[PDB]
Design a protein around this ligand. Structure first.
Ligand SMILES: Nc1ncnc2c1ncn2[C@@H]1O[C@H](COP(=O)(O)OP(=O)(O)OP(=O)(O)O)[C@@H](O)[C@H]1O
Ligand SMILES: Nc1ncnc2c1ncn2[C@@H]1O[C@H](COP(=O)(O)OP(=O)(O)O)[C@@H](O)[C@H]1O
Ligand SMILES: [Mg+2]
Lengths: 308, 237, 158
């Protein structure tokens, strides 16, 4: 609707019903939408979570209306209802009218005067049961799509991106290294991996990799340093002969003016990542979920389509 | 001119009877025509429990039970055409022979439909190049299916035609060196060539089945449809 | 002390860690976890996440509240105690202000430990109820979101 639409402006028929995304919990959504923000229009109104459920009567029905208005009235703009725990988990289960009328608000806002269809739509809920609501109608939200825990294999892409993507027009790496070997077990066999090891495959493992550069050897043995007043073999008098406190009685000669040295390099203080640090990291696996949930969630996944 | 039923409930203390009295006044102020009413779950009158509970709110239903039924019994000018689906959420203090009867049901056609032909007839206004109408193969869909997704499938077919012409113009861009010094200025090129070809539609690729065979799950076919179909007779009458 | 009395918290860190007996390499890993980002900053003067928060869930009668002030004393952390429910107030629409206040005072006292004692007082089940979304939910979810979403960049607080 924005790359080819400008060359196919005739735009024959129905508008796009946006995003009916779902996936596994804790993953798979905002990391996409926040980047899609590069071309959405204005920086979209990512309001989300409980924020709709203001107070007993009217307030949510005011705010949602002004939300859609102030979103569209400048430019195309997404929203971020995400989980339907925000709105419309079921009919009933309400008090004073907080939810169910604002559900019917949603069904009436979604028509007629969006300004530009580049409003799209965006829902992103985990665990796409607990909706049971008419907004699944094709003219109200688009087709369902899953975000899921894959096989390990894409972890190599994930790792290399995380290492190399974040840049300051510098070609910097978050965790600089030269590859000591191929990923081997890391790409394809790294753990039981039923739950994903998430950023926790790199977080803390980073500090472990830093320890082999900052704590081992010198810092565990001496205070390393160079230039300035420095240590000297003063040899002025015996340390303890006349009394137990002769040592360091005299003060230093001068205060330092200034000194210059780079903060980091491939030579020093960098992360020096290795395959065996990732071996330690995967030994310290913490899978985000277990099959005792996925046996239920898999049902919740597959029953969401072809089934209701 | 219709009640917009979810909106316009004022929160303010004892105010909102004003909005019901105003909306029916403004309705009657046009002599001849109906008011649409959404699901009555827009009002969701629910006999005092597990919800609004009739206490801190009664102000809409306590008026609507009376005054528009007075008009309805004089039976002139203004008429109701509500679209209820979930009577289990409603008190049935309306929806009854004593006030607002004619609980009217149709169901969803099983498979024998002229609405497939009317589907074709409304994919029309955009061209199908074939001489044969080729509609009937859509009935390869498993029966009990005939919902609004008919036009979601026309949308998917149109998007497939769009994808075809998009990759065709991408091919033309790739070979644009045949008439420009570089494969450049696409955003100028399409406008300065403009050799018609103005998204003329390509329903010939029959891609409505190519969508339908995915079992496009925005259709509803579950036991919930059977629930509605049975309770419409068993309680909806 | 005059600063802490006028602007900071009452009852400053004031106890000998020597008195917290019996805790073992558990206190080792705890203390090292709060020591190292405080006094070995070359390993920690970096943009990644760095163990910004902890919680405790032991039964009563093993002293948590004591060890919190003690570890704070071990590195002269700035100290603020949320004494339980005093986030609450009459004014729906303003009671959340004490939450922004917590990060205001923390940011004003960069090397700080923030301690929610009896956190249950502002932490029901996050999946609380199918009843109304009362103030007890709106305060706690906003707090959890903000303590997830801010000071996560302005590193330094605990
Ligand atoms: N080294 C120690 N090891 C274990 N317990 C100790 C130690 N030193 C003191 N205590 C005991 O710990 C008790 C504190 O128990 P606990 O932490 O459950 O209470 P609290 O601080 O009132 O709790 P809360 O965290 O719920 O506010 C003190 O009464 C004290 O007797
Ligand atoms: N490649 C990745 N795989 C999984 N999670 C990621 C990845 N990259 C970033 N994240 C995490 O995604 C989180 C936000 O995504 P989201 O799916 O909204 O999580 P949640 O479902 O918990 O809200 C961030 O905390 C970020 O650290
Ligand atoms: Mg305590």
């Amino acid at each position: 609707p924005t790359k080819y639409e400008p060359i196919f402006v005739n735009c024959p028929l129905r508008l796009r019903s946006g995003i009916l995304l779902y996936g596994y919990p804790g993953c798979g959504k905002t990391l996409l939408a926040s980047a899609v923000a590069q071309q959405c229009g204005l920086n979209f109104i990512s309001v989300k979570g409980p924020e709709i459920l203001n107070k007993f009567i009217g307030a949510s029905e005011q705010n949602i209306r002004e939300l859609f208005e102030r979103a569209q009235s400048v430019k195309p703009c997404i929203l971020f209802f995400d989980e339907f725990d925000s709105i419309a988990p079921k009919r009933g289960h309400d008090s004073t009218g907080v939810t169910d009328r604002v559900v019917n608000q949603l069904l009436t806002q979604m028509d007629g005067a969006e300004g530009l269809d580049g409003v799209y739509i965006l829902a992103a809920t985990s665990r796409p049961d607990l909706i049971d609501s008419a907004l699944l109608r094709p003219g109200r939200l688009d087709k369902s799509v899953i975000c899921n825990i894959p096989t390990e294999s894409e972890r190599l892409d994930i790792l290399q991106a995380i290492v190399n993507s974040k840049d300051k027009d510098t070609g910097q790496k978050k965790f600089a290294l030269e590859k000591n070997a191929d990923l081997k077990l890391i790409a394809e066999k790294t753990a039981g991996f039923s739950g994903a090891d998430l950023q926790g495959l790199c977080y803390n493992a980073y500090l472990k990799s830093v320890h082999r550069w900052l704590s081992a050897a010198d810092q565990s043995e001496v205070v390393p340093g160079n230039d300035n007043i420095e240590y000297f073999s003063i040899n002025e008098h015996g340390r303890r002969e006349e009394n137990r406190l002769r040592l360091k009685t005299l003060l230093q000669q001068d205060v330092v003016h200034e000194t210059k040295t780079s903060t980091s390099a491939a030579s020093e203080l960098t992360a020096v990542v290795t395959i065996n640090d990732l071996l330690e990291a995967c030994q310290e696996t913490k899978p985000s979920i277990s099959t005792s949930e996925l046996v239920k969630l898999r049902g919740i996944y597959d029953r969401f389509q072809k089934d209701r | 001119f219709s009640v917009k039923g979810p909106e316009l409930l004022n929160m303010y203390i004892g105010e909102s009877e004003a909005n019901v009295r105003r909306v029916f006044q403004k309705a009657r102020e046009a002599k001849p025509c109906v008011i649409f009413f959404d699901q009555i779950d827009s009002v969701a009158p629910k006999r005092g429990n597990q919800g609004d509970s009739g206490g801190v709110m009664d102000r809409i239903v306590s008026q609507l039970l009376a005054e528009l039924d007075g008009m309805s019994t004089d039976a002139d000018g203004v008429f109701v055409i509500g679209a209820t689906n979930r009577p289990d959420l409603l008190d049935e203090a309306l929806l009854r022979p004593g006030r607002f009867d004619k609980l009217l049901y149709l169901g969803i056609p099983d498979t024998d439909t002229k609405q497939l032909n009317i589907l074709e007839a409304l994919t029309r206004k955009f061209v199908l190049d074939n001489d044969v109408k080729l509609i009937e193969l859509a009935k390869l869909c498993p029966f009990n299916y005939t919902g609004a997704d008919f036009y979601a499938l026309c949308s998917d077919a149109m998007l497939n035609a769009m994808s075809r012409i998009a990759r065709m113009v991408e091919k033309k861009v790739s070979q644009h060196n045949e008439l420009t010094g570089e494969n450049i200025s696409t955003r100028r090129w399409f406008d300065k060539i403009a050799t018609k070809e103005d998204t003329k539609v390509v329903v010939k690729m029959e891609d409505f089945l190519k969508a339908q065979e995915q079992l496009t799950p925005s259709v509803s076919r579950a036991e919930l449809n059977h629930y509605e179909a049975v309770r419409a007779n068993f309680e909806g009458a | 002390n005059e600063f802490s009395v006028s602007i900071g918290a009452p009852q400053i860190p004031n106890v000998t860690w020597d008195d917290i007996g019996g805790i073992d390499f558990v206190k080792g890993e705890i203390l090292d976890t709060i020591d190292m980002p405080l006094k070995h900053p070359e390993l920690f003067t970096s943009g990644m996440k760095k163990r910004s928060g902890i919680l405790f869930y032991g039964p009563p009668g093993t002293g948590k509240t004591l060890m919190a002030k003690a570890i704070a004393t071990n590195f002269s952390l700035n100290f603020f105690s949320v004494k339980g429910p005093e986030l609450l107030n009459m004014y729906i629409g303003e009671s959340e202000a004490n939450v922004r206040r917590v990060f205001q005072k923390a940011r004003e006292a960069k090397p700080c430990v923030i301690f929610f004692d009896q956190i249950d007082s502002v932490a029901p089940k996050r999946g609380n109820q199918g009843d109304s979304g009362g103030v007890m939910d709106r305060i706690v979810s906003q707090l959890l979101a903000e303590l997830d979403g801010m000071s996560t960049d302005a590193d330094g607080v605990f």
